[PDB]
Structure formats: C-alpha cells, structure tokens
Design a binder for this molecule. Structure first.
Ligand SMILES: NC(=O)c1ccc[n+]([C@@H]2O[C@H](COP(=O)([O-])OP(=O)(O)OC[C@H]3O[C@@H](n4cnc5c(N)ncnc54)[C@H](OP(=O)(O)O)[C@@H]3O)[C@@H](O)[C@H]2O)c1
Ligand SMILES: NC(=O)c1ccc[n+]([C@@H]2O[C@H](COP(=O)([O-])OP(=O)(O)OC[C@H]3O[C@@H](n4cnc5c(N)ncnc54)[C@H](OP(=O)(O)O)[C@@H]3O)[C@@H](O)[C@H]2O)c1
Ligand SMILES: O=C1C[C@@H](c2ccc(O)cc2)Oc2cc(O)cc(O)c21
Ligand SMILES: O=C1C[C@@H](c2ccc(O)cc2)Oc2cc(O)cc(O)c21
Lengths: 335, 335
C-alpha cells in the first residue's frame, strides 16, 4: 500500500485527515505526544480497528523525533503545529517553536528518502494581514503574504500566530528547496465540520459561538473579519480532500489557499439564526460595531480550482451541515 | 413620494403587497382587469381612502396595456400572471400567455424610464421539479431549474404551470439584460395568511384543505410533496416584506427563493389537528403514507437571508396565525 504520515493524530484537522486517508486506501502512520491518554486518542483506536493505522509518540519540538514515523512513507502531512494564538510571549511560545518544529519535521521527511511530497498545513493568517489594501473590491491569492512588520509593530490579538505562519512557511519552503524535496503548503481559512477527535476545541468554539452565545468566540469571528476583510469558511471534508488532492496531483506545487466561501459575521449570524431557531442567535448589530454587510476583501481559491479541485460544500448550509452535532458531542453546545 | 406599481390588485398576493406598500409610505398604482366589479375590487377602494392608491384598468395579455400604470413608478412589482394550473391546453392557456404577458409588462417598465427595478413574482414550481435527485439529503437553491423536458414528456398535473414559470423567467431575464433594467425574481413556495382581497381562492383552498376536508385540495398538498420532496410554506407577510426588501436593496440581484419552513403533509396535519380540534383533521394514513415522515428535499432560503432578509413567521403556529379566519371570511371554511 501507499503510506501516509499525519502529525498530531489527536488534533481536529489531523483526526479528520487520518480518517479520510484510511477510507481512500492508504496505510497511515500518525504521531501523538501522549498515546497513553485515551481520553484524547480513543478515535485512533477506533480507526485502528478499521484500517491500517499506526500510532507513534513524538514531539515535533525535539529534533529527529519524527524520523521513525515518516520512515517508509510516500506522503507526509504536517498538520501538528503550535496553536498558542494568545501566548503571553509569542516569540518564544508560538513563533520560534513553529519554525523550529516545521524544520525538524521536513528534515525527517528528507532523511526518510521515500517521501514523495510534504504537505504542510499552514493558515490563511499567513496571507490576509494586508493593511496596505484599503477600500473594497480586493481579492487575495497565493502571492499575498501577511505583513510581519505591521504585526510586530502593532501586535493585534493573535499577531504571534499570524507571524509564525509566515515565517514557518518561508523557512519550510527554503529548507525543502535546499534539500530537493517537494513541498506543498495549504493555507486553509476557518474550517468547519465534524471530525473523529473526541476532545478538541480549537476553532470549533469560535465557529459555533453564535449558537453557544460565547462572547469570546464571537470576538474571534469579529476579529477575523476586521483584520482580513471577510469571514472565510471551508468545510473540514473539503480541506481534507484538498490535502489529498495536492499530495497526489504531481502537477501541484507551491502554496494553495483552501477556502470555499467568503461571507461576513452578519451574513453568517442571519443564516444561522434562520437554520437553527432553537438557539437564540443574535442578529441585530447596531452601529459602532465596525461590521461589514459584505466582504471587503475575499480569499481566492482559483489556483486550487484551476488545478482541478472541486469543493463539495459550497453554501453556508453545506458548510454547517454536521458541526452542530459535533459541538454537542464535544460539550461546546449544551443541547 | 416613491411610487410603486403592482399588477393585479384584486389578486391574493397582489392585494397584500399593495396594503404593505401603502403602510410603508409608498404611493401605489395598481392594475385590475375589471375595476367595475366591486365585489372583487372593494378592498382597493378601502385602501384608496386610507392612502395614495391609484387603480387602473389593464390586461397583461395586450401589448402596452401597462404603459400608463407603470409610468412615473420607481419600482414595478409584477405579481399578476396566468394561474390556469390545470388548463386543458396549457401551451395556449398558460405557457404562452405567461411569457407574453411578462414580456409586455417588462417592456412597459423599460418604456417608463423611471423604473429603477422590476420585482418579478414567479414560483417555487420553477425550481423544484428535479426528478434527477433520488433519496433524501438534497437542498435546492436558486441554481435549480424545473426540468422542462421531464415535464413535457410526462405531463404531470400542473406541468404547464411549472413550465410557464421556467420559460417566463428566462425570457424576462434575457429581455431585461438587453435593455439594462434591473430585474429581480422571487420564487415563493406555498404562501399562507390573510390578505385584503375579498373574493380570492387560489392556494388558500389547498392550504386549508385539511380543515375543510376538501379532497381536491388535499390532493394538491400531497402532490407538492410527492413532486418536490417537501411541503414548503411561507407567510404572506414575509413574502411581501421580502419583495419590498429586494426592491430596496441595491446589492440584491437575480433570482431569490422565498421559503420559511420545509415540512411535510403529515407534520402539517398533526399540527392542524392539535391546533384546531373543532375541525375533523385526518392524521392517520398508511400506504398513501407514501407521504414523507420528514422532508426529502428542502428549499434553501440562504441567498435571501444572506442578502439581509429575516423571516418573522418561522413556526407552523406563526405561519398559520391568521389564515383560518381569512378562510372563513372567504367562504372556504364554514365556521
Ligand atoms: N481549526 C481551524 O479552523 C483552522 C483553520 C485554518 C488553519 N488551521 C491550522 O491547521 C493546524 C491544525 O489545526 P487544529 O484546529 O486541528 O488544532 P488542534 O485541534 O488544537 O490540534 C493541534 C495538533 O497539533 C499538536 N501539536 C502542537 N504542538 C505540538 C508539538 N510541539 N509536537 C507534537 N504535536 C504538537 C497537537 O498535539 P497536543 O495535543 O499534544 O498539543 C495537536 O495534535 C493548525 O496549525 C491550525 O492553526 C486551523
Ligand atoms: N398563492 C400561493 O400560495 C403562491 C405560491 C407561490 C407562487 N404563487 C404565484 O404568485 C402569483 C400570484 O398568485 P395569487 O395567489 O395571488 O393568484 P390569484 O389570487 O388567483 O390572483 C391572480 C392575479 O393575476 C391577474 N391576472 C391573471 N391574468 C391576467 C392578465 N392576463 N392580465 C391582467 N391580470 C391578470 C388576475 O386578475 P383576474 O382576476 O382578472 O384574472 C389576479 O389579479 C401567481 O403567479 C402564483 O402562481 C402563489
Ligand atoms: O489554530 C487555529 C486556526 C485559526 C484560524 C482562524 C481563521 C482563519 O481564517 C485561519 C486560521 O483559528 C483558531 C481559533 C481558535 O480559537 C483556536 C485555534 O487553534 C485556531
Ligand atoms: O398559483 C398557485 C401557486 C401554486 C404553488 C403551490 C406551491 C408552491 O410551492 C408554489 C406554487 O399553488 C396554487 C394552488 C391553487 O389551488 C391555485 C393556484 O393559483 C396556485
């Protein structure tokens, strides 16, 4: 069989990727940091009783820890990454560990000799910090990079996360090219949908905040719109198929935005209020709230599409098709 | 004042639209075919003594008939249309007059020069004839068009009505684009609620059939579900507000489904049986329970809700809040 490595099998996106790879007939090796924690990793046993899944222990911050897991793999999906969006000391707790851990992982992939392609999962946060674009009508593509200097000078919330994505991508791209290994980078927007992982929180807390009523989650969604010009969404299923697509399509190369739809907080609030009447969805925003009626800047996925990929969740109704039941199971929603 | 034209002021939806436009401060001009029939048109005098309403005589089948009425209007609400759902000769009694009357109306709107936007009332019957979708889990949006080929090949009941909506929509859009006039099309599902018109019947006969026991109306409801995959409902007041919203919302464009709730014959029957025990509502079926237990195909109003519209009647109780009294006043219900 063809074998794939997925770092961070207990993560939100990582757990979904593993499930899809197995379904598509791959043998899968995944790393977690504490396999003995079956609260976090029970889905890996569930999947492991269904398909050829291997679970290993590794911390990406330790050089060479990934050597064994990626040995004998055709593809390496580097999903695991530091996600301290709000660290007190971002340079040391988010940025430096991100760059160092990504280089550690690519080094292991090179060492393995068998890895045909590395698939690095980054984020739209490395793309859409663009304070030089004013007014509306803007459309960002893979040539757009988040303004690191602006981020370090002004340090808005989650600035360290945005910087870490920019720096780790460039470090990864340089390392891969200097060692002759093919590297594809995927920059997904906010990802929504059910996954096998039983104890994840991550962005689900935020994407469900209009239904849960959590004001911190609501601030995150507002922050995305304010800082990037829109609220961009993609379904977990489309993200995982996109990663498989980019791994398999030999003609694929370089960076790829993964984004199905550009909306706004107000649009999403209205739609969710309409689709889920049982929740008290606040839709009446009033003035000061610098909220957009329509996107000012959109993220373009034309490169991935013209590459041959097709999204299957193309409306708000389809992007939010199964996340509510997932939120219930995770305890993020009560009922 | 801003001035709006409404065709067919004696019609069910037309009469409700006129009352709402007058309430919202519009000067209104409406056309009827026989203003001297004050049994059908008395509500227009009642409205005329309360607000700035002009009543004119016109038959949409005759080219130019609408010229005078729509002259000086900022918006034109084309509500009047042939409703011979069961014509013996649909081609000549339903389809051709529909296309021709709509083109006549839009031509008059262009000639007026003042019409900023045309709001064309069409029907969900132009959307949900989709024999290619089997199983459940389907959601239809504005890109779904009723299958005219299937309709002409099998000629199910009301096939001529369904075809007329598809053709008049496409002909109208091609004409509007060539003349650079904004045309927005609304495709309501089964519309329910009280209206000023005193002698209308239309779908009220069918939407009240579970209370009246009329088996022809009950057959129409079962037919909607069997042919479209659900029993879709919207309140007259939400439809009228939606039409105003789309007229006034500069960003709005193209076609819009108007649908508050996707339910079933059985669920509606159980709801009506509990709400109105004085009437004898049949809730026990079987075999004939080819009736769905839950919608197989749902009409998605996501485009309209994203545009900025919010439904105010969202439950069966809210959708059926005042239709029964109206049915009494119309003689459709005895008591
Ligand atoms: N969720 C979204 O909506 C979204 C959208 C766009 C981009 N992204 C990005 O895609 C990546 C995955 O996101 P996610 O939502 O799945 O986050 P998550 O649920 O919190 O999972 C993060 C994974 O990374 C692991 N990890 C972190 N540091 C590690 C380390 N030093 N060594 C080994 N493993 C480490 C974590 O393992 P531990 O449990 O041991 O910490 C976990 O498995 C993230 O980089 C995210 O920023 C997410
Ligand atoms: N009622 C619903 O539940 C529903 C749901 C979805 C869509 N719709 C569609 O919305 C439209 C209005 O529906 P409705 O319930 O209000 O029907 P309605 O009560 O029977 O009224 C029909 C109106 O159209 C007029 N009309 C027909 N042909 C005309 C012509 N050649 N020239 C001038 N006027 C003409 C009629 O005037 P006359 O009296 O002189 O014939 C009448 O005013 C219809 O196209 C319907 O198919 C209705
Ligand atoms: O790691 C991520 C991804 C990030 C994100 C949001 C929007 C976007 O467009 C790209 C990335 O959002 C989050 C929000 C959280 O509460 C926790 C998280 O771990 C994350
Ligand atoms: O003109 C219409 C609208 C049509 C309709 C029903 C459901 C739907 O979803 C869309 C349209 O139903 C009707 C039923 C009638 O007895 C008489 C009518 O004149 C009509």
């Amino acid at each position: 069989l063809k074998t794939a490595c997925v770092t961070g099998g207990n993560g939100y996106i990582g757990s979904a990727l593993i499930k899809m790879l197995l379904e598509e007939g791959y043998a899968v090796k995944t790393t977690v940091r504490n396999p003995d924690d079956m609260e976090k990793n029970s889905h890996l046993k569930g999947l492991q009783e269904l398909g050829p899944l291997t679970v290993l222990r590794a911390d990406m911050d330790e050089e060479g820890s990934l050597d064994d897991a990626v040995a004998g793999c055709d593809y390496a999906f580097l999903v695991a990454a530091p996600v301290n969006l709000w660290a007190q000391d971002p340079e040391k707790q988010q940025i430096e560990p991100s760059v160092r851990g990504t280089l550690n992982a690519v080094r292991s992939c090179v060492k393995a000799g068998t890895v045909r392609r590395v698939i690095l999962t980054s984020s739209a946060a490395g793309v859409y910090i663009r304070p030089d674009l004013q007014g509306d009508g803007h459309a960002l593509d893979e040539d757009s990079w988040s303004d690191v200097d602006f981020l370090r000078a002004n340090k808005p919330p989650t600035w360290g996360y945005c910087v870490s994505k920019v720096l780790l991508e460039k470090a990864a791209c340089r390392f891969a090219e200097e060692h002759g290994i093919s590297l594809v980078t995927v920059c997904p927007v906010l990802t929504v949908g059910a996954a096998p992982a039983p104890k994840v929180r991550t962005s689900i807390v935020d994407s469900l905040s209009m239904l849960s009523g959590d004001e911190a989650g609501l601030a995150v969604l507002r922050g995305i719109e304010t800082t990037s010009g829109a609220l961009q969404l993609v379904h977990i299923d489309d993200l995982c198929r996109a990663e498989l697509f980019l791994a398999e399509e030999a003609a694929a190369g370089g960076r790829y935005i993964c984004c199905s739809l550009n909306t706004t907080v107000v649009e999403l609030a209205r739609f969710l209020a309409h689709k889920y009447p049982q929740y008290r969805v606040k839709t009446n925003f009033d003035d000061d709230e610098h909220l957009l009626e329509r996107p000012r800047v959109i993220m373009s996925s034309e490169k991935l599409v013209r590459e041959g990929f097709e999204y299957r969740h193309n409306t708000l109704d389809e992007i939010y098709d199964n996340v509510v039941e997932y939120g219930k199971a995770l305890g993020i929603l009560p009922y």
